[PDB]
Design an enzyme around this catalytic site. Structure first.
Site, short mmCIF file in Angstrom:
data_model
loop_
_atom_site.label_atom_id
_atom_site.label_comp_id
_atom_site.label_asym_id
_atom_site.label_seq_id
_atom_site.Cartn_x
_atom_site.Cartn_y
_atom_site.Cartn_z
N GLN B 32 0.82 -1.23 0.12
CA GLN B 32 -0.05 -0.09 0.01
C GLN B 32 0.91 1.21 -0.02
O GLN B 32 1.93 1.19 0.17
CB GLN B 32 -1.09 -0.01 1.14
CG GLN B 32 -0.53 -0.20 2.59
CD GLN B 32 -1.44 -0.90 3.66
OE1 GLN B 32 -2.65 -0.92 3.73
NE2 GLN B 32 -0.67 -1.50 4.54
N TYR B 62 -10.22 4.90 19.86
CA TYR B 62 -10.24 3.55 19.15
C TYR B 62 -9.41 2.54 19.89
O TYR B 62 -9.95 1.37 20.19
CB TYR B 62 -9.61 4.01 17.74
CG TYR B 62 -9.65 2.70 16.99
CD1 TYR B 62 -10.67 2.14 16.47
CD2 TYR B 62 -8.23 2.09 16.27
CE1 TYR B 62 -10.53 0.94 15.51
CE2 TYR B 62 -8.28 0.91 15.62
CZ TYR B 62 -9.64 0.16 15.10
OH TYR B 62 -9.56 -0.49 14.33
N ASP B 87 0.54 -0.27 13.77
CA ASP B 87 1.14 0.92 14.33
C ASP B 87 1.66 0.66 15.93
O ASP B 87 2.21 1.18 16.57
CB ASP B 87 -0.09 1.95 14.35
CG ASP B 87 -1.31 1.49 14.88
OD1 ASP B 87 -2.24 1.03 13.89
OD2 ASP B 87 -1.72 1.47 16.08
N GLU B 107 0.71 -8.69 11.12
CA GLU B 107 0.48 -7.72 10.40
C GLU B 107 0.94 -7.87 8.89
O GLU B 107 1.99 -8.55 8.79
CB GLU B 107 1.17 -6.49 11.10
CG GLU B 107 1.52 -5.39 10.00
CD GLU B 107 0.58 -4.53 9.59
OE1 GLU B 107 -0.55 -3.80 10.27
OE2 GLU B 107 0.24 -4.58 8.17
N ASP B 156 -7.67 -5.35 14.32
CA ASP B 156 -7.71 -3.73 13.75
C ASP B 156 -6.87 -3.68 12.43
O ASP B 156 -5.86 -3.60 12.23
CB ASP B 156 -6.67 -3.21 14.77
CG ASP B 156 -5.97 -1.83 14.76
OD1 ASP B 156 -6.98 -1.25 13.93
OD2 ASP B 156 -5.28 -1.39 15.14
N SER B 157 -8.25 -3.83 11.37
CA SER B 157 -7.97 -3.88 10.23
C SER B 157 -8.02 -2.37 9.66
O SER B 157 -8.61 -1.51 10.02
CB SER B 157 -8.81 -4.77 9.28
OG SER B 157 -10.27 -4.27 9.51
N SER B 158 -7.39 -2.44 8.52
CA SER B 158 -7.52 -1.16 7.67
C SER B 158 -8.98 -1.48 6.76
O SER B 158 -9.68 -2.66 7.15
CB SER B 158 -6.57 -0.76 6.27
OG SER B 158 -6.07 -2.14 5.93
N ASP B 159 -9.63 -0.48 6.15
CA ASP B 159 -10.75 -0.87 5.20
C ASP B 159 -10.65 -2.07 4.38
O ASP B 159 -9.87 -2.45 3.64
CB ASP B 159 -11.03 0.47 4.85
CG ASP B 159 -11.42 1.73 5.68
OD1 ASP B 159 -12.13 1.21 6.71
OD2 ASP B 159 -11.05 2.69 5.30
N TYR B 224 -12.19 9.66 11.90
CA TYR B 224 -12.68 8.62 10.92
C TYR B 224 -14.08 8.94 10.36
O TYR B 224 -14.65 10.01 11.03
CB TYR B 224 -12.85 7.12 11.43
CG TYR B 224 -11.65 6.53 11.97
CD1 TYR B 224 -10.65 6.51 11.37
CD2 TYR B 224 -11.69 5.49 13.16
CE1 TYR B 224 -9.43 5.70 11.82
CE2 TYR B 224 -10.75 5.04 13.58
CZ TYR B 224 -9.36 4.89 12.82
OH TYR B 224 -8.46 4.18 13.48
C1 LIG Z 1 -2.85 0.53 10.72
S1 LIG Z 1 -3.94 -0.61 11.51
C2 LIG Z 1 -4.60 -1.55 10.18
C3 LIG Z 1 -3.38 -2.45 9.71
O1 LIG Z 1 -4.03 -3.52 9.11
C4 LIG Z 1 -3.26 -4.25 8.10
N1 LIG Z 1 -3.70 -5.08 7.38
C5 LIG Z 1 -4.60 -5.13 6.30
N2 LIG Z 1 -4.65 -6.13 5.72
C6 LIG Z 1 -4.33 -7.04 6.30
C7 LIG Z 1 -4.23 -8.45 6.35
N3 LIG Z 1 -4.76 -9.34 5.33
N4 LIG Z 1 -3.62 -9.33 7.44
C8 LIG Z 1 -2.99 -8.68 8.37
N5 LIG Z 1 -2.79 -7.20 8.37
C9 LIG Z 1 -3.66 -6.62 7.56
C10 LIG Z 1 -2.62 -2.97 7.50
O2 LIG Z 1 -1.38 -3.39 6.70
C11 LIG Z 1 -2.68 -2.05 8.34
O3 LIG Z 1 -1.32 -1.86 9.14
#
Ligand SMILES: CSC[C@H]1O[C@@H](n2cnc3c(N)ncnc32)[C@H](O)[C@@H]1O
Ligand SMILES: CSC[C@H]1O[C@@H](n2cnc3c(N)ncnc32)[C@H](O)[C@@H]1O
Lengths: 280, 281
Positions: B32, B62, B87, B107, B156-159, B224
């Site tokens: 990314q 959060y 993070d 991660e 704690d994922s991204s979108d 957010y």
């Molecule tokens: C910043 S907190 C969100 C974290 O989710 C992570 N993330 C996204 N997709 C995945 C995945 N499939 N497995 C593990 N971590 C992930 C992203 O790289 C990001 O650092």
């Protein structure tokens, strides 16, 4: 295709934008710049002096929490005043209470009522209720000689810059206090806990000079800065405004979209950092 | 002074912007686009694929809600998994529990952990804790063949646009369920109730196929989209996640800025319209 952006000296360093589908009305009234537009995703939007006052998509959150918090605590309210609230969203929620006798509204800017009647019919529909009496006046002047009248006063003002500047000072709170019945309540729109906690503390302090119980609640609303707004809750009795005395079970209340019994009390459970700032 | 504006197809027709004091770091990782900048009023800000992940000023809301809701319900949680969370914020909150024995983090993007160590030391400080084990992998792959291991899983994922796409499906939730102990809990970031009802309904439905009790809690956070984000709360017992079994009153918890015992339960008192939608899942 353009965007509207809300930037302010009241919240520097951040901004919120909505994409414009089309502009519906813009004019300068005697008191403020008035803009109405259809956004692409939040429906119609009302803007005063460049600040979002409402959108169709989320306005119910604000209007329902500001109304039903005090109206489920006051028993048998007969006289209620809305200060500001020209769009009529508060009056809409108040009309649902069949045993209120007189709903008085004091709105400085008659152009906001007109525009709301024209462009926001689902918001301004309460103006048709024959219990509604409209007074076009600065509320600070309207309240100066009223005493012992209102069971609930709801201060639905715009922000301190513009005509609402008279509504965020100690003198106004004294007027509210005197205008209330001995057991009356006031709620007022109050700064977001994510922006100027010092302002919240100032406002609680002006209220606590007069009122026996002063409380603060939060409402989620995405189109106000920081996605939330406060309610300053003022009670003359010791029991305060955190716990409703009744459930909104009749048919007028079936369609509420935000307020319910549980979320009433939840609204006053505030983040730990704020509690610490306002406890001391 | 330039502005940063957060646009996404996940929130069409709106945008939040922050005034940029200075740009600190920008790179394309294997997964990314990574951006760190110092804002004028929120401190430093981590951005991934053009989406705000955290800011210094409000990140505690959060991280604290995500962590302390399941950690106060689980009676004696010893082994905890964080999915995503590069993070470090969830790890920081978890380290406060002296009784935890092990913290695994999975991660996908190691650049995000590197950047957090450099620019977010008050968030990434738990990576020093000797209980912390780091795996760099798609958590969807990691959890294949993990069984009956974790007391708590925190997602704690991204979108779902980007590498987190593999965490927002039924298959992922089967893996979560299998990896948790028989009374284990999972919480997962689950978007904004003002604009993501579709996703919220899909996610709750995936969780309900497996877990006996599935609940949704809301957190106020201004950076957010819509100023809030939800927590999908998954329990294998009927008592669920709305009532804590412990209070966070000891020294290790003196610094909490959002979470407390009443706020835990209040988070689950949802707007009326959302309740009606969840009835239709
Ligand atoms: C910043 S907190 C969100 C974290 O989710 C992570 N993330 C996204 N997709 C995945 C995945 N499939 N497995 C593990 N971590 C992930 C992203 O790289 C990001 O650092
Ligand atoms: C739209 S809801 C907010 C409203 O408060 C009204 N308002 C602002 N200042 C005052 C005031 N001093 N007295 C009465 N109403 C006001 C504004 O004109 C607006 O319609």
């Amino acid at each position: 295709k353009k965007w509207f952006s809300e930037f302010s000296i009241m919240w520097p360093g951040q901004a919120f934008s909505l994409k414009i589908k089309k502009i519906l009305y813009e004019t300068k009234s005697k008191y403020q710049n008035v803009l109405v537009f259809e956004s692409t995703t939040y429906g119609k939007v009302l803007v005063l002096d460049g600040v979002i006052q409402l959108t169709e998509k989320d306005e119910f959150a604000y209007h329902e929490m500001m109304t039903h918090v005090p109206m489920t605590v006051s028993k048998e309210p007969k006289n209620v005043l809305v200060v500001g609230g020209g769009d009529g969203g508060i009056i809409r929620e108040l009309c649902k209470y069949k045993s209120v006798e007189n709903i008085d509204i004091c709105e400085i800017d008659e152009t906001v009522i007109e525009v709301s009647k024209i462009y926001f019919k689902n918001i301004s529909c309460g103006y048709e209720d024959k219990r509604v009496n409209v007074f076009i006046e600065d509320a600070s002047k309207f309240l100066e000689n009223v005493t012992n009248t209102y069971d609930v006063i709801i201060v639905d003002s715009s922000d301190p810059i513009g005509p609402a500047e008279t509504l965020f000072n100690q003198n106004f709170y004294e007027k509210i206090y005197n205008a209330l019945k001995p057991n009356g309540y006031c709620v007022a729109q109050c700064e977001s806990l994510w922006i100027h906690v010092g302002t919240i503390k100032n406002m609680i302090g002006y209220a606590k000079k007069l009122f026996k119980k002063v409380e603060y609640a939060n409402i989620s609303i995405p189109t106000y800065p920081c996605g939330c707004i406060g309610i300053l809750c003022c009670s003359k009795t010791d029991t305060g405004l955190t716990k409703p005395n009744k459930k909104l079970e009749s048919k007028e209340f079936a369609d509420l979209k935000y307020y319910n019994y549980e979320n009433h009390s939840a609204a006053f459970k505030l983040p730990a950092f704020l509690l610490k700032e306002i406890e001391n």
